[PDB]
Amino acid sequence: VTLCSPTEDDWPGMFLLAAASFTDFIGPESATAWRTLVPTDGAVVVRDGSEVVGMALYMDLRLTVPGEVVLPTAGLSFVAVAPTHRRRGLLRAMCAELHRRIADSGYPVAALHASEGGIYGRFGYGPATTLHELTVDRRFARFHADAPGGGLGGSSVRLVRPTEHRGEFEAIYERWRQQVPGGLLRPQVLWDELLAEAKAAPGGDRESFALLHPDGYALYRVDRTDLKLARVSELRAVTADAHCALWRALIGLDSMERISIITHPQDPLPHLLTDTRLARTTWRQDGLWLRIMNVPAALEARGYAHEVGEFSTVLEVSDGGRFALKIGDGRARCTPTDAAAEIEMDRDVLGSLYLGAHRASTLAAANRLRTKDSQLLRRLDAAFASDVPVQTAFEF
Amino acid sequence: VTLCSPTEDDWPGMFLLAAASFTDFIGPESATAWRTLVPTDGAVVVRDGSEVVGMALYMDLRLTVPGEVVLPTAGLSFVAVAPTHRRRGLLRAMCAELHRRIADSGYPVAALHASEGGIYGRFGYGPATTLHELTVDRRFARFHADAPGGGLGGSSVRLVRPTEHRGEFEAIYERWRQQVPGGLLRPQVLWDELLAEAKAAPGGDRESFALLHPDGYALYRVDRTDLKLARVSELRAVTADAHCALWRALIGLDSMERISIITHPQDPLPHLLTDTRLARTTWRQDGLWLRIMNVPAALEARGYAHEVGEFSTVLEVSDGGRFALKIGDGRARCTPTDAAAEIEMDRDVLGSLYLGAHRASTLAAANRLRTKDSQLLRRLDAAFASDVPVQTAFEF
Amino acid sequence: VTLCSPTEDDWPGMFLLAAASFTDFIGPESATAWRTLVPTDGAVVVRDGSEVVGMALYMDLRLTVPGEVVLPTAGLSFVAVAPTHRRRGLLRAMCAELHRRIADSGYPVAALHASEGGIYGRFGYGPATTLHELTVDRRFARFHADAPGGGLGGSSVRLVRPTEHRGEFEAIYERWRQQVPGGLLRPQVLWDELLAEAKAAPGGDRESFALLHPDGYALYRVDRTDLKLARVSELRAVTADAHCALWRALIGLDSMERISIITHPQDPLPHLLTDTRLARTTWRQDGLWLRIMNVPAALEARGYAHEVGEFSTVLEVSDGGRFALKIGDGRARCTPTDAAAEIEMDRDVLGSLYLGAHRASTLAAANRLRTKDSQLLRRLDAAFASDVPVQTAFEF
Amino acid sequence: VTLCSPTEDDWPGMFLLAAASFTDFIGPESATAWRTLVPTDGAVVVRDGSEVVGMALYMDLRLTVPGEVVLPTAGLSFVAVAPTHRRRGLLRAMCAELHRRIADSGYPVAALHASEGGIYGRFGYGPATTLHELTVDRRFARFHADAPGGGLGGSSVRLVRPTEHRGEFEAIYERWRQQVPGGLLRPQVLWDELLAEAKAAPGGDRESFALLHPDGYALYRVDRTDLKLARVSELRAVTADAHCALWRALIGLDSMERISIITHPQDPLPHLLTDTRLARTTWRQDGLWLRIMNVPAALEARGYAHEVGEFSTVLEVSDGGRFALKIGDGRARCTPTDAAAEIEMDRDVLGSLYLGAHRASTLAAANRLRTKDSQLLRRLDAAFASDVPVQTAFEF
Ligand SMILES: CCN(CC)CCNC(=O)CSc1nc(N)c2c3c(sc2n1)CCC3
Ligand SMILES: CCN(CC)CCNC(=O)CSc1nc(N)c2c3c(sc2n1)CCC3
Numbered sequence A, B, C, D: 001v002t003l004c005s006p007t008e009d010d011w012p013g014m015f016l017l018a019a020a021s022f023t024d025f026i027g028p029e030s031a032t033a034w035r036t037l038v039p040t041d042g043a044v045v046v047r048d049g050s051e052v053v054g055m056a057l058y059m060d061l062r063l064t065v066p067g068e069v070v071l072p073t074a075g076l077s078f079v080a081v082a083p084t085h086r087r088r089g090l091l092r093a094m095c096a097e098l099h100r101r102i103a104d105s106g107y108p109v110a111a112l113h114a115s116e117g118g119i120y121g122r123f124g125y126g127p128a129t130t131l132h133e134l135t136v137d138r139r140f141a142r143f144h145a146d147a148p149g150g151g152l153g154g155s156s157v158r159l160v161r162p163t164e165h166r167g168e169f170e171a172i173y174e175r176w177r178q179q180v181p182g183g184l185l186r187p188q189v190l191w192d193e194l195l196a197e198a199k200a201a202p203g204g205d206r207e208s209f210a211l212l213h214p215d216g217y218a219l220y221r222v223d224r225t226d227l228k229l230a231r232v233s234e235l236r237a238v239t240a241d242a243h244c245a246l247w248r249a250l251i252g253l254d255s256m257e258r259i260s261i262i263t264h265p266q267d268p269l270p271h272l273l274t275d276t277r278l279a280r281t282t283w284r285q286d287g288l289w290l291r292i293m294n295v296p297a298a299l300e301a302r303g304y305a306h307e308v309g310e311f312s313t314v315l316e317v318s319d320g321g322r323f324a325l326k327i328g329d330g331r332a333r334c335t336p337t338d339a340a341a342e343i344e345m346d347r348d349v350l351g352s353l354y355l356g357a358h359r360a361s362t363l364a365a366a367n368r369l370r371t372k373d374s375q376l377l378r379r380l381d382a383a384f385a386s387d388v389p390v391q392t393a394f395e396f
């Protein structure tokens, strides 16, 4: 039970463990594409004296954080231990080895999507974004008088085949991801993959359609079994106009009873309708999880609310260092210190605060974040909050 | 079809319309108690030339708003039109008459709980608070190391009959409602009613139990049909310690699979667990709706974030006046003006912003709130936000 | 947190804990009756410095074991720890104290019905009987030619009110319980209770009917919600004739689609039908659990298969002693010894073997029962097996 | 309507009737393989004056019976009458003709798997084995301290592709089938078929995985629609160690909530867990059915319990002869006689007793098995019982 970087010869065994450990696995032809995003020495395997009984890897990603700042981000993925080798600390060992490599390569943050809500807290990952399913009974949906694009003349939205308008979707996603906290650069090979799932599969998913605006798009397909439900796989909009116009078109799908979409808690859709309640929240879950690899590098890299005045403090991260934090003009300076700590928190808590998804007040109430000064808590809340609301890019 | 204040002789007819129009109706013996909270000339009826084909009334309530300020609040309730008299503008006429009386009696705000999400926007009511059902699979629930009250020695929580500890529940609710935006004064007669629903009914709801802390309580009963689900009808806690201690006890109900509770979006419960995801959000809805009756009186009455610096502007409410708004030191001055408007919004939008439940950014994205300056939008967001998270008191 | 016998003053607090800890609780008026079966010093409570945070008790029962031998049996029941006092070893302490008293009072065995399948193994209780739900689609049910009582002339079964034929039900149950392993003496006060549940409750269970034979009875009621299902609460029959005759009558309920009954794995009903499969097994669970308090006293007290020849061995019970076991002529002699052990098992395993419900072969395969000689295993299997099939009397 | 052996020209018509009469039909490409196991003159068809309106056939099988004795067994299969020709005695005629051929070819027993529980009793077939679905909530499953292979060091179980380890599965199944009552020889062509269903089908079943031990294997796949359920299609284990080790691995499938398997009533899995009840019995059905073709040949061929002493009797089978049965030393001598019968039974009853699945006591209680001496009944029970528990090999 030794812990090595995989050879080319090791990948068939990894794909076997993958098939057994993840049901959503596409298969080796699709993995070719994602593999391209794994750097050299971005993967560890655990052989038994053989076959693969444990694997982890990271991908080179570009995460947009508050202040339209883009960080290089190690995306952890393809983590699996064989059912034959559970409770043997193979996960503790593999994660520890990748976190060493991620740190020494100079990534300030790591990120992942959790398959359980209880595994990842103990390795310093905090839930940083919130998925939020809205389901619209579109039979009752009337737009408010105040809603944009509710006059005479033509629609600016077209119904199209996704495959014939790849260029426009790329353009729009690129604009979107650069100005939205949680945004990820989506490389060429993941657009190849997104548009191979647009085509209908025999006895599988149905044909995907696109609504295309100059400044937005929405990919949607009808559900496999429930033929009165349209699922909106992806809606990107750079302007309120684009967002409203796309939803007028989705509400216009008169052969459907319901439109479902996985979106963020601040999605404005409910306020576009005469009746807010027609957009029922049916489902809610942690989205992207962040581990802050270098605290000073990460805290300094992002923007903060201009609205709160300049203020200073000492932050202590359990087994992560202690820092003089000074925040004014929406910039931060984070420097070493041995001065008495004013705030303590575990590294995962910092991960949750970082994209402005979770308020310090809330985490403090749970005693996940200790301080003795509530004015300092009001100020963290206010500073760390994101002007633009935080969103989940794509699963990896 | 004339519109009058009801005589004593009119109430039997109102109770008939009530029984037909509301399924959740307790019956005339229970109405005695709520009636006490309706002022003289707080009720209108519509007779047919007879019988009652339309009624509305308001109750005298005390709503806690940001800055621990308590406003006198007209609570609209018992609104019904006979099925025999629909689409006859009886609602438009009754609401218009009560809103006159509410305004002339000097109530700064009115409030209600909506039976549909689409009726109340057009009369100037905005959804001001958010209900949020959490359901815990308590079989998997382990508390985090950081959670308060997880050591040796005794528990501070007792299991009790609700009826024998009315005094303590009152004390605690009184403390809670005075420091929490959305808090309502609960008069003697509504505690009589709350504790008459604590006792098991033949072929109805099961016996209610209470967990009592020095600084918190939780009323709970097992579900009628689903005997592995406990419903938490009410949990009030004045301290993080009380809140944690009460949830340790609820998770300790080892004969249950699930605990459900209707709570607020900032409930810290999820952060108390090793696995945030065990506390699934199963349901979400508008709670309390506010109509701002006097804009200057209401805007001036509440507190604002100290964290944002002093700033000025002109707010225009559609058919509600135009005001020079000046906000600094968490106080506001709101005075008449004919100066060019910087912000426009309908009166319902103001209602939604007022308790800090909804961000101006979000309502602006839906074009429910027009401005041409996004720095002013950042500032409204920041000012109107509530330090203490907004909660829903009780239904009326 | 001290551990005492309850005063009369302590019972209200126990009834409160009961209501909170058991949903199936009838209420204090019904407890009067069961209380009569609890000896003096048969109950322990745990007060907090007060109120009751923990209780256990045993009842004086008479368990019929193989060889129509009747043992005095401590029936453990009413075991509860407050949700406010979990994981505090109150259960470990209460069970340890009752087991001392049960042992010193000279009970050879203790018994209980488990609310979870995982709590009771560690205190030396083994599942000793198996409940088995049969559900008959009675529309397709035709009796075999070989089935008794399928000729001309009159039926010997009558449809009656249970309350007017208490005497006959008692007579028959008394006959049944004396000749059937798992049989319990049912005292006067538990017949009072059984016949108070026969009468229909407002918005609860429906009226119970009885089919009465000279040598059998069946109590049945139609299900609350599913009106095409009859539930057979209890069927006792002393003769194959009685059993067949009662089932002809139940299959004769032509307004029902399904008859369900909770019975034992050897119930002959399936073999009475032309189609065995019409009697689907829908549910299966451990019934009665036994803890063997005195190994020599219990092993010596029961009968064994005459069919296996005389044979000897050394049995070792973990922390329960080591015994020279000699079995011939369906009697056993069990005497102390320090000779090398041939069979080892934990005390719960012995409990499972004792009424002949579980084969040693099976428990050996799970390594719950160690031996190095498989001829000795064949012999235990054969000896401990019950000629008459083991059944579950009533829940306590 | 004549009754002939099929020509090569008749098989297309049989395949048509097959497709219409059996939904689980694979299609003619798969039938090539099973056809190989049908002897010459093992099939009858009924033409209409044409097309095929009725078919039956038998396959040459090798059934393992108690005493590790292997009998040649006619496996009846592919029995169908056209919907156009029901209630015309085509089944009575076809079965009668095959039973003549099966008898004259010198097969001592015939076997089948029933599509209804009520058709096959009247042709002398008795349910001989019991299928038993266990479903494990594997989230709560902890193994007992007594369970084998729960120490440090390596696992002996590997996760593999089934297709690359055919040899090992064959070896293990061969060992298993020779020592287990109900065991069937599985020829080369049925391993070809088993491993063609291991591969995922488009819009059908998912990829099958194997857990391989030196002395056991388990084939499993995730359910089509329910993605949190793993179905265990086949688990063969020659040692308790193999069985425990394979289940540790299945419980180790951490992405599943439930493991279901179709197994036998004596499966030791429940006793391997700290909580027996986590292994719920969800489903139960007759498995293999036996018709005893030659009573003396079959009764003499199998082994009997050594534990019961030598004893004699006269058995009478309705329209099947009368025999002096003498049983001692686990051998039987069965010779003709006209002496007064002590036991009577129909031929199906004998089929049920033969593999030791059903106790004579039970069938006697249903009057399916008449005797006037209950000591003789105790002795049949004890003799016919199988030391090794009876299992169901594969469906045909
Ligand atoms: C629940 C687990 N999942 C399935 C893995 C997580 C991924 N969940 C997704 O939604 C995206 S599908 C996907 N994602 C990848 N990162 C990859 C990678 C491949 S192959 C692939 N496939 C080889 C290199 C890394
Ligand atoms: C969906 C409609 N509902 C039922 C009315 C709304 C009230 N919804 C509740 O949850 C509280 S029950 C209640 N509430 C009242 N305000 C009152 C009042 C009575 S009688 C009563 N009863 C006479 C004077 C006013």
Ligand SMILES: CCN(CC)CCNC(=O)CSc1nc(N)c2c3c(sc2n1)CCC3
Pocket (backbone or CB within 6 Å): C022, C024, C025, C026, C030, C031, C034, C035, C038, C057, C077, C078, C115, C395, C396
């Ligand atoms: C799941 C828990 N259950 C409810 C207790 C177990 C009992 N389960 C039953 O089915 C019988 S109802 C019953 N049984 C009793 N032994 C008793 C006793 C009372 S009151 C009563 N009531 C006071 C003295 C002991």
Ligand SMILES: CCN(CC)CCNC(=O)CSc1nc(N)c2c3c(sc2n1)CCC3
Pocket (backbone or CB within 6 Å): D022, D024, D025, D026, D030, D031, D034, D035, D038, D057, D077, D078, D115, D395, D396
């Ligand atoms: C419910 C009916 N079934 C479908 C037939 C029973 C068989 N049930 C099974 O599970 C095995 S699939 C199978 N079995 C066969 N014996 C055969 C045979 C073929 S083709 C085939 N296919 C030609 C010669 C005999």
